[PDB]
């Protein structure tokens, strides 16, 4: 469905998934809590 945790995405296109969020100042995809 979606890539693993640590996989640098766009934010903002909601590349990764729902429960992860793509990091801005990190550019990697991550947990939110």
């Known amino acids: 469905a979606c890539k ?7 934010p903002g296109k909601n590349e990764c998934c ?8 990190h550019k990697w995809c991550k947990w939110k809590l």
């Open 4 to 10: 693993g945790v640590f996989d640098a995405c766009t």
């Open 18 to 25: 729902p429960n992860r969020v793509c990091s801005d100042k």
